[PDB]
Amino acid sequence: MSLLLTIAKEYKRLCQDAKAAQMMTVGTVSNYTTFKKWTTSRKEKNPSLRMRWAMSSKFPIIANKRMLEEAQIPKEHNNVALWEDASASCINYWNFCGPCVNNSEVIKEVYKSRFGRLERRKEIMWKELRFTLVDRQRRRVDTQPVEQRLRTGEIKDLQMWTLFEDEAPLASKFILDNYGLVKEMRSKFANKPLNKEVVAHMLEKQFNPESRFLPVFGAIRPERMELIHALGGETWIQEANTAGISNVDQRKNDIRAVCRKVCLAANASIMNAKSKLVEYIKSTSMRIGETERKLEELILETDDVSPEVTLCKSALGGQLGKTLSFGPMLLKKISGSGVKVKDTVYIQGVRAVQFEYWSEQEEFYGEYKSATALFSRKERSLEWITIGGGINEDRKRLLAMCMIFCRDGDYFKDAPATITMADLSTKLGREIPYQYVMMNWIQKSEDNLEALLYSRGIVETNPGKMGSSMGIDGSKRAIKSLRAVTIQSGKIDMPESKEKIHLELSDNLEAFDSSGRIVATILDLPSDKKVTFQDVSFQHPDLAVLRDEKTAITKGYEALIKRLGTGDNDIPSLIAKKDYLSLYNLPEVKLMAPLIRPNRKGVYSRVARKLVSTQVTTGHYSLHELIKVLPFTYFAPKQGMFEGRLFFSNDSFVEPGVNNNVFSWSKADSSKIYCHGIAIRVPLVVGDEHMDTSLALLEGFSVCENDPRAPMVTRQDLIDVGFGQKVRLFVGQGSVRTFKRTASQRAASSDVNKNVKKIKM
C-alpha cells in the first residue's frame, strides 16, 4: 500500500545517487551476500562486561517509537523513566499487563524439537544410582531423534517453499516427490504473524541429526544420547528404562530387511543382476509415520554401514563411508597397504584352489557384537590382536573371523579333510573363494571353530601375563593360552575419518573401491528368511503376490491416471470445457468396462454418470472420486435400486465417498491412491477443492524457448492459464523465464542407460 509507494520512492532516491546506482546495475544479485559483510562488522572481546557496563546506563534499551505509541502504555506509571518520549523495567510492565496476542499456541509447533525433548523426558522412569568404573567407548553417534532426515539442499528448498513462495526457486524433484511434507509444514505457518527467519532456523535444526564423537556406554539410541549426561559418567550410573521412546530402530531394521530381500532377489539374473536391482529399488517405497517415501531417497539419507545398504548405495551411485565388512563383522583400516598375491590350497589330497592374499603390514580395528579388537596382519600372518570385549563367545567369534580375514593358519595351506569340492564353489554357477567357505565352516559347527583356534599355536601362560591371556573358551586367565593373543579391559575406541570414497560393483555384486579390496558382497548376508512387511509397496511384477484380478484393477486405475496429463482429449482439459460426455467414451473406461459387474452395470453407470455431471457443471468436484467412478460410465444408464456400493466382478466394491481398502485416499496426502495396498502417484497438473494451492500445478508447467511476446502474469494466475499456452514468469530471485503448460518429463535414467548400452556394441 502506501508503504509500497514509500519503497518505490526510496528506490528512486537511491537510484538518483551515482555510486549506489553503479553497484546495483553491475553484476548479479549474489553481490548482496558479499555486501552483507562489508557492513555492520563489529565484535567485542568480553561481551559480558560490556553488557554489565551498558545495563547500568540511564537508558540501556532501544525501542521503536511507533510500537510504543501504538501500545498506548503510560509514559511513567509511577515516576519511572520507561522512555524519554527506554529502560528495561518497561518490559516488565508489558509482561504483567499490556497488549495480549490472540493466541500463543503456535509456539508448540515452532519449537517442536524441544517440546519433543520435554515430552520424551517426562516418560523416563529413573531406577537407581549406582557407582562403578564405567567402560566408555569414544564413537560417533547421533544425538537428536529426527524423522525424515534430509540434506541441506532439500532443507533450503523446504524453507523457501514453506515460507517464501513468491520468491520460490524453480520446482525441484524433491518438492514434487515430497508434497505431503511441504503441505503439512505450509498449513501450520501460513497467514500467521511470525518472524520468518526464526521459523526457518528452527526447521533447519528440526531436520538435522546432531552427530557427535562422544564417549558412550550401553545401548546407542538418540533418545538416550540427548541426555547421556544424566545417565552415567566415568564413575556412576543412573539406571533408567528408555526403550519405548521415539522408536527409530524398527524402521532402520525394516529398511535393511528390504535391502536384503531385493539384493537376494536380484542375484538370480547372472547377466543383468545390476539392472534388475536398480529397477527393483526404484519401483518400491515404504511408509514412514504419515508420509510415504521412495526407497532410493531413504537409502541415500541413511547412515547404516551394512553390506545391504552399502551395495544399494553403490548401485545408485551414492558415496559411502570408508568401512569394510566380513560377514556379520565390522572392520576399519587404520593404516598399512598391500597388493594381491595368489597361493594354492589343496582341498583333499591334490586339488589346487587359488586364493589371493595381501602382502604388507596392515592394522585393522574390528567390531563384533559386544566385542572389539585392534589386530594387525603381515604377509599372510596374523601378527597380533588386542581385544577389549566383554563376552567369551563374541571374543572367540571375533578372533576366528579375524584369523580368517588374514588367511593365517595351516588350514589355508592344507585345507581340512571335511570340506569338499561340492561346497567350495558354484552354488549357483559362481565361484565362492576359500575364505567364505571357511566362514561357513566355522558357523556350521562349534567343533570346527575349536579346531581352527587350536590351529593357532598354544603356549604356557607366563607369569604376570596371566591377566592378559585368552584360553580356548575365552577365559580371562589360564595356565595355557593362545599364542600372541593379548587381552585387556575396556572397549577399543572406534577410529574416525570424514572421508567419502566412490566405489563401483561388479556383475557379481563385488563392490570395488578404486582398488582390489572387496568392501562387501552378497555372500556375507543371512542365508534367507521370510518376513511380512507392513506399509510397503513392491510395485513390480516379479515382486508381487496378488492375483490377476486385483492387479488388473490396479493397472486399469493406473491407466486412467495416465490420461491426467496435459493436452486436449484429456480429463482436465475436458473438465475445463465442461464436456463430461466425452469422459464416458475414453479408451481406458472401455478397457476397464469388462471388469464391472455386468448384472447391475447400467445402474452403477447411471449414478456415477449423474455424479460427474453435478461435479463437473457446478465447479466443485473431487478429482479422486471422479477417477474412482469413471470406470462405470461406459455402459448405457438403466433403472434400478442403488444400495450404495459399486461392485466389480471380483467381489470387491467401492462406496462413493468413504475410503476402503480397495480404493483409499486422504486430504492430508492428496497425491496418493491406495489400491489394495498399492501406492499410485497422481500427477500434479490441476488443483482440487481440498488440494488447491500453488503446488498442485507445478508438474504441468515446464520451461521453453524465450518469447517476449507472451504476457507476464502472477503466480496465482497460473491457475487460469490455458493448456499449451506460453507465459513469462519471475522465478526465484533475478530470474525471468518462460513456461509452457505441457507436461514433458520423460525418464532421463532409462534413455541415458539405453544409449550407453548401445555405445558398447
Binding site: 509507494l5 528512486k12 551515482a18 548479479t28 553481490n31 502472477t714
Partner: protein, 50 residues
C-alpha cells in the same frame, strides 16, 4: 542467485506486487500508474546516470 542485477529484480518484483494488489488488494488504478511511472523514471535515471 541469478543473472539479473539488483535494480532489475527490484523493478520486476515491485511491478508484480503492484499489479497483484491492484487486481484484488486495496490499490487504485491511479496509485498503480503513479508507482509504475515512478519506477520507470527511476530505471531511466539509473541507466542514464552511469
Amino acid at each position: 542467485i541469478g543473472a539479473m542485477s539488483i535494480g532489475e529484480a527490484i523493478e520486476e518484483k515491485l511491478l508484480e506486487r503492484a499489479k497483484m494488489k491492484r487486481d484484488i488488494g486495496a490499490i487504485e488504478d491511479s496509485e498503480y500508474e503513479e508507482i509504475k511511472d515512478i519506477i520507470r523514471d527511476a530505471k531511466k535515471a539509473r541507466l542514464e546516470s552511469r
